[PDB]
Design a protein around this ligand. Structure first.
Ligand SMILES: *[B@@-]1(O)O[C@H](CN)c2ccccc21
Length: 270
């Protein structure tokens, strides 16, 4: 507690202007100081689960040395909306590693569903998260049904805090072996969908990896990231949003602004 919210930031005004709710957890891994706002509330994961999905695949690859190289062929019926990479390889197949990279870096939905099947579905991914000590995360459905973002529905949700804690374990801690940890970091660093979210609050000369989520309804969107400011320890953070009405729009700018406030609250000069 002593190191949580040492410096208050105007998150309430930000979410009121947005017309919804913002949840933020940010950790300075050097000192343990944190910024926390609605951090234990549940928010829909949307596509943000795909980062943890790739981490679960990497964990399995520690026991299955041929897994990442395995070629996966799929039919047209596997190509659900927003599959920008896997649609280009329908006639050839893709490797497990390629599917994982596409799920992380392009939010590819066909890739995500194929990898979910490899792990035993939503319960298999949930079990992986339990195995690293995350008791909050739950995945319940597949793409695209998991994006419904219904107010009060706990399916396919986590909390900003648990997201940040799990992200820390996987990217900086010991939940993955060192080679797989760096592969997970590298996939996050190569994400293409997050330039207007946490990255927009991070100076260009700092390293950063992230995974976004956008549900398309209920103003529900999010991003989580690991950030390496030069000269100090890395920061891990998560920013999640939702809003009360089905046709409320999400805002990338609100996510970037919340990330800026989190970094300011931690005293990280940007
Ligand atoms: B997921 O939140 O990320 C992508 C991009 N906005 C996507 C598309 C369609 C459904 C879910 C998701």
């Amino acid at each position: 507690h002593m190191l949580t919210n040492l410096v208050a930031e105007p998150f309430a005004k930000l979410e009121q202007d947005f017309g919804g709710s913002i949840g933020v957890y940010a950790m300075d891994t050097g000192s343990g100081a944190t910024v926390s706002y609605r951090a234990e509330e549940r928010f829909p994961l949307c596509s943000s689960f795909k980062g943890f999905l790739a981490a679960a695949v990497l964990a399995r690859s520690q026991q299955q040395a041929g897994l990442l190289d395995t070629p996966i062929r799929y039919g047209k019926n596997a190509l659900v909306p927003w599959s920008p990479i896997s649609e280009k390889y329908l006639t050839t197949g893709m490797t497990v590693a390629e599917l994982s990279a596409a799920a992380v870096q392009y939010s590819d939905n066909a890739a995500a569903n194929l990898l979910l099947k490899e792990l035993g579905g939503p319960a298999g991914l949930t079990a992986f998260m339990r195995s690293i000590g995350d008791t909050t995360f739950r995945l319940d459905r597949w793409e695209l049904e998991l994006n419904s973002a219904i107010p009060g529905d706990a399916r396919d949700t986590s909390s900003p805090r648990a997201v940040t804690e799990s992200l820390q374990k996987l990217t900086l801690g010991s939940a993955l072996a060192a080679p797989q940890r760096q592969q997970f970091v590298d996939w996050l660093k190569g994400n293409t969908t997050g330039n207007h979210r946490i990255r927009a609050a991070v100076p260009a000369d700092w390293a950063v990896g992230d995974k976004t989520g956008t549900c398309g309804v209920y103003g529900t969107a999010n991003d989580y990231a690991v950030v390496w400011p030069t000269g100090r320890a890395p920061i891990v953070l998560a920013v999640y949003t939702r809003a009360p009405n089905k046709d409320d729009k999400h805002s990338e700018a609100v996510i970037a602004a919340a990330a800026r406030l989190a970094l300011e609250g931690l005293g990280v000069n940007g």
